[PDB]
Amino acid sequence: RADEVDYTNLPAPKPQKTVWDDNIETEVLRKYLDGLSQYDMEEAKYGV
Amino acid sequence: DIMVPSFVYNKLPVIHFLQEKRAEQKLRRVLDETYTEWTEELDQAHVTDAITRSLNI
Structure with missing residues (x-):
């Protein structure tokens, strides 16, 4: 009967940088x- | 009648040459002071970002 699991451990959410279609508008x-992508990643790491 | 005219005649060439050089110097200085001015204007990306903040997105 050894250690089973650390219930107080959560796999941190994996942030994925949004990719925009390569057009002239981009x-x-x-x-x-790019600023929106950075904000989204920040809002992912922290949560909101 | 004789002397002063002769010395003025002797003077003429050097004065002409010096005045030509002076005019060329003026033209050169005029050209050298010309520079193309490039002005920097606020990037519209910041304006778009501010618009988004007003949109509350």
């Missing part, structure tokens, strides 16, 4: 879209 908005 190039014009490259910085803005």
Whole structure:
């Protein structure tokens, strides 16, 4: 009868960086879209 | 009638050459002061980002 499991351990959620279609609208908005992706990843790690 | 005219005649070439050089110097200075000005304007990406913040997205 050894250790079974650490119930106080949660696999941290895996953030996935949103990818935008490569169009002219993306190039014009490259910085803005990148900021949204960074915000989404931050909201994923922290939770909200 | 004789002396001063002769010395003025002797003077003419050097003065002409110096004045030509002076005019060329003025033109060169005029050209050298020309620079193409490039102005920087606020990137519209920030404006779009602010618009999103107003949208509360």
